[PDB]
Design a binder for this molecule. Structure first.
Ligand SMILES: Nc1ncnc2c1ncn2[C@@H]1O[C@H](COP(=O)(O)OP(=O)(O)O)[C@@H](O)[C@H]1O
Ligand code: ALF
Ligand SMILES: [Mg+2]
Ligand SMILES: [Mg+2]
Length: 726
């Protein structure tokens, strides 16, 4: 076991900074007194203490499994040391660990650096996402099976940056399709990314990039898949956060390019004024407009199609400045001041429709009756809800048109045999107020971590028990019950939300009370005492309390009748093309459920990833100030524990990554030792004896399969290739 010396350096617990560095000064029977470099003297039992590796280089260890002292402080200190010398990447078994640098490293990601990793093995070079990308490319041809790379972490930990690296390297192995997949990121980030408290350039939509490869290995096609874009940001923004980049790009654009839009300072427009943050130090909005147009030309978006897109973006900004006051008649709406009539006229001119038809779209809805057509009027509060509804649907139809035009140039089938898919989702985020959009984001992260848990801890250890192997079970925290809490078919938070959405005039307190009487006897569900309509979920990353105030509203997906009627009446080809013409030999739907639609998309994505061989990259956010050179133990310790990094190191150190059937084993490696006899095609004793003849040790013989350590299968294929070639 462990026995501390009278004078030695050990790790001890501390209220802050997690573990602290100390030196024992006194030794009792079972307790010891440590002395930290800080000077404080702590007293604790020996079992709480952990030995410290004094002989540790600043470079640390490239693999956490090769660490001399496997425990939490050594993992934390190995990470910290490599972070100080700008070595952000580090391996854990086959998994890659990435700590956010929060600074530019041009040499670490140059195209020359790609050539260095072109033929490199996973462990030959220093850890890098290019090595994970190459591993996915090599394992695709050696197996003929599709691959997928899965990037995880909390919000702002570097998933989107990590995905850009994988795409730049994957385009290098198959190489005009390559250029357009790389230029699709700036276009989508202009309309799907915005500043939050967690990330200055936070992804508000999840993407799944699919790279197609033919049998020869060329990049035949590529496709991008986007999931639940947040459109509520268009209308309501918190003070720290910012609206989508496109709005600020257009206000910083050269005046001759946007002279027709009649744009003002950003602080004037209602959809941006709520934030009170209009500029970013890390983002130059003027350059982003020039970069986005440049990227749009690469994808093939016509310059005339670019003008109509920005006309919609500038129109949405004008629409937000249309205030409503009480009309002369009861429950009537009218523009408040003459400035709202300016914006109402401008937004109609930018949308190529009638100014009065636009005004009648927000102030007055029409009731549907077979006997005659009647028009009611709206109160100012109802009219405000009608203009915010118009903007959201206009922005999502615009964002969806982009993803359709992107794949209309880079998406095609050349009868390819397999693909590689890198997955970029939104990270687990928690704010002082948590809406329905957060509920789906954290659900997505919850589902991805379960996939990690299954393919790393559940499926691996079931085989170990199945094969009668000598093995100590490694316990872990499973989040399956949280998934059953949300997407259970016979009553889940998603399923219950559709129930309350069917009943008209259902308040958020009724859906709230329904959650309490149903999930009362549950471990992962909690209710705040003073909050009637707020519910808390014990997420794997931490407790998050949600507000159901807007849950029923965010879930219903519908198109306002007079909204689609106006947008269809537009003289501009692009504006009318944003809404499909329904009701002509077509079915009319009351509303569609976003919760079930998003759940269905999440299951289909999971089923495609279950047919591919996965590769994991765990991103880590080192600090919350979004600045470099700040390594915080508490932030990183809580991410390692809830992410299961400690258990993964334990499974990678003692586990067996590769297993082959006896018949597959004697066929390939029986040629290594011709003198070793074999009784039949699947004889287990020959496997034991053929491995001893080669000199391998630590292997384990199972019920029906052999089990080898991380690098033991690799040298057997190299030994085989040498003898068969001779
Ligand atoms: N490899 C990297 N090189 C440079 N900056 C990085 C890198 N990874 C992350 N960052 C920084 O972290 C920020 C957030 O990263 P991002 O990919 O947006 O995380 P997430 O997708 O999880 O929100 C970036 O805007 C950038 O400043
Ligand atoms: F932009 Al994120 F998690 F915050 F992908
Ligand atoms: Mg992102
Ligand atoms: Mg929404």
């Amino acid at each position: 076991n462990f026995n501390p010396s009278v004078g030695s350096f050990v790790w001890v617990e501390d209220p802050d900074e997690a573990w602290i560095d100390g030196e024992v000064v006194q030794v009792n029977g079972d307790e010891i007194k440590v002395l930290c470099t800080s000077g404080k003297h702590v007293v604790t039992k020996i079992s709480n203490a952990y030995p410290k590796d004094v002989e540790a280089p600043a470079s640390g260890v490239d693999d956490m499994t090769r660490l001399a002292y496997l425990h939490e402080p050594g993992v934390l200190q190995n990470l910290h040391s490599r972070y100080d010398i700008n070595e952000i990447y580090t391996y854990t078994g086959s998994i890659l660990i990435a700590v956010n640098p929060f600074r530019r490293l041009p040499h670490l990601y140059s195209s020359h650096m790609m050539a260095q990793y072109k033929g490199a093995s996973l462990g030959e070079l220093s850890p890098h996402p290019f090595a994970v990308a190459d591993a996915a490319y090599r394992q695709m041809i050696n197996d003929g099976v599709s691959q997928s790379i899965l990037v995880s972490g909390e919000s702002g930990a570097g998933k989107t940056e990590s995905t850009k690296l994988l795409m730049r390297y994957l385009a290098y192995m198959g190489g005009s399709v390559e250029q357009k997949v790389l230029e699709s990121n700036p276009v989508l980030e202009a309309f799907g990314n915005a500043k939050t408290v967690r990330n200055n350039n936070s992804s508000r939509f999840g993407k799944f990039v699919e790279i197609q490869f033919d049998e020869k290995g060329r990049i035949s096609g590529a496709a991008i898949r986007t999931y639940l874009l947040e459109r509520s940001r268009v209308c309501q923004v918190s003070d720290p956060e910012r609206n989508y980049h496109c709005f600020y790009m257009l206000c910083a654009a050269p005046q001759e390019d946007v002279k027709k839009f009649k744009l003002e300072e950003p602080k004037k427009y209602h959809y941006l004024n709520q934030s009170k943050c209009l500029e970013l130090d890390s983002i130059n909005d003027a350059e982003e407009y020039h970069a986005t147009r440049r990227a749009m030309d690469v994808v093939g978006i016509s310059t005339e199609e670019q003008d109509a897109i920005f006309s919609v973006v500038a129109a949405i900004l004008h629409i937000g400045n249309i205030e409503f006051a009480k009309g002369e008649e009861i429950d009537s709406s009218i523009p408040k001041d003459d400035k709202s009539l300016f914006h109402l006229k401008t937004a109609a001119e930018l949308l190529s429709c009638d100014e009065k038809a636009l005004e009648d779209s927000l102030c007055k809805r029409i009731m549907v009756t077979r006997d005659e057509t009647i028009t009611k009027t709206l109160d100012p509060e109802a009219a405000t809800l009608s203009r915010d509804a118009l903007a959201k649907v206009m922005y999502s139809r615009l964002f969806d048109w982009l993803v359709d035009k992107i794949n209309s140039s880079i998406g095609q089938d050349h009868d390819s045999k397999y693909l590689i898919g890198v997955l970029d989702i939104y990270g687990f985020e928690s704010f002082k107020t948590n809406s329905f959009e957060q509920f789906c984001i954290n659900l997505t992260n919850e589902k991805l971590q379960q996939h990690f848990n299954q393919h790393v801890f559940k499926m691996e250890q079931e085989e170990y028990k199945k094969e009668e192997i000598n093995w100590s079970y490694i316990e872990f925290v499973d989040n399956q019950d949280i998934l059953d809490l949300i997407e259970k078919k016979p009553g889940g938070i998603i399923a219950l939300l559709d129930e309350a959405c069917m009943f008209p005039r259902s308040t958020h307190e009724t859906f709230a009370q329904k959650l309490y009487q149903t999930f009362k006897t549950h471990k992962r569900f909690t209710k705040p005492k003073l909050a009637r309509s707020d519910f808390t979920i014990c997420h794997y990353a931490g407790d998050v309390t949600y507000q159901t105030e807007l849950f029923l509203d965010k879930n219903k997906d519908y198109v306002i009748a007079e909204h689609q009627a106006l947008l269809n009446s537009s003289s501009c080809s692009f504006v009318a093309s944003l809404f499909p013409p329904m009701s002509d030999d077509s079915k009319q739907s009351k509303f569609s459920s976003i919760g079930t639609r998003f759940k269905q998309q999440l299951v289909s994505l999971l089923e495609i990833l279950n047919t591919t061989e996965p590769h994991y990259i765990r991103c880590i956010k080192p600090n919350n100030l979004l600045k470099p050179g700040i390594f915080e133990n508490e932030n990183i310790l809580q991410q390692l524990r809830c992410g299961g990094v400690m258990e993964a190191i334990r499974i990678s150190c003692a586990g067996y990554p590769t297993r082959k059937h006896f018949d597959e084993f004697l066929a390939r490696f029986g040629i290594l030792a011709p003198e070793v006899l074999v009784k039949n095609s699947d004889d287990p004793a020959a496997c034991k004896k053929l491995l001893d003849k080669v000199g391998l040790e630590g292997y384990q013989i199972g019920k029906t399969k052999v089990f080898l350590r991380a690098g033991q299968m690799a040298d057997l294929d190299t030994r085989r290739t040498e003898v068969l070639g001779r």
